[PDB]
Curated annotation (Swiss-Prot):
Full protein name: Lysozyme g
Subcellular localization: Secreted
Active site per the UniProt annotation: E73, D86
Family named by the database record: Belongs to the glycosyl hydrolase 23 family.
Key words of the record: Antimicrobial, Bacteriolytic enzyme, Disulfide bond, Glycosidase, Hydrolase, Secreted
Miscellaneous notes: Shows preference for N-acetylmuramic acid residues that are substituted with a peptide moiety. It acts only as a glycanohydrolase.
Gene3D superfamilies assigned to the protein according to its UniProt record, in alphabetical order: 1.10.530.10
Catalytic activity entry: Hydrolysis of (1->4)-beta-linkages between N-acetylmuramic acid and N-acetyl-D-glucosamine residues in a peptidoglycan and between N-acetyl-D-glucosamine residues in chitodextrins
GO biological process: defense response to Gram-positive bacterium; killing of cells of another organism; peptidoglycan catabolic process
Origin species: Anser anser anser (Western greylag goose)
Disulfide bonds: C4-C60, C18-C29
Classification of source organism: Eukaryota, Metazoa, Chordata, Craniata, Vertebrata
Pfam families: SLT
Length: 185
């Protein structure tokens, strides 16, 4: 159903770096900061809950992981302009980069979340192949990190997020995702 690629609850996380938290207005960092940021985005997220869950169920990925990416990438659409990110390259709740993939659908619909989620799954698969001695959940983590920085950037489990935006991509996302999971996603 939703567990084909792992369980976010089983992944270890150090959460948001201060590079991510500060700018969001927090005076502290880590897992609790991630969750606080996730909570500030819940109401906006809730607007798309049904769709997030429908796509997760379709593709056999946890809806909370999709929600976590959404929060991180666009704050559930709050920082977008007609679906575009501030540099004009990312499109949609999940911020598909127009330079790498032609964007499909409306910015906040099922087509878009499908596309973004598919890209994610492809990164997961690549990591599964690249490190077949990792556990499924570890692989999920690596797939999320790659979503931000590419598969090439994942050379180990411990330092995967170095080189991602704020050096905390997946750790942050996973912490946000754990908050979501707690909230019915």
């Amino acid at each position: 159903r939703t567990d084909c690629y792992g369980n976010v609850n089983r992944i270890d996380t150090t959460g948001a770096s201060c590079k991510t938290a500060k700018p969001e207005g927090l005076s502290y960092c880590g897992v609790s900061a991630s969750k606080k940021i996730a909570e500030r985005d819940l109401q906006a997220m809730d607007r798309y809950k049904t769709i997030i869950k429908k796509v997760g169920e379709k593709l056999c990925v946890e809806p909370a992981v999709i929600a976590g990416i959404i929060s991180r990438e666009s704050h559930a659409g709050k920082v977008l302009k007609n679906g575009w990110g501030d540099r004009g390259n990312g499109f949609g709740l999940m911020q598909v980069d127009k330079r790498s993939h032609k964007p499909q659908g409306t910015w906040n619909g099922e087509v878009h979340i499908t596309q973004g989620t598919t890209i994610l799954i492809n990164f997961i698969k690549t990591i599964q192949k690249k490190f077949p001695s990792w556990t499924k959940d570890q692989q999920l983590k690596g797939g999320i990190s790659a979503y931000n920085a590419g598969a090439g950037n994942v050379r180990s489990y411990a330092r995967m997020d170095i080189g991602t935006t704020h050096d905390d991509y997946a750790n942050d996302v996973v912490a946000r995702a754990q908050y979501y999971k707690q909230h019915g996603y």
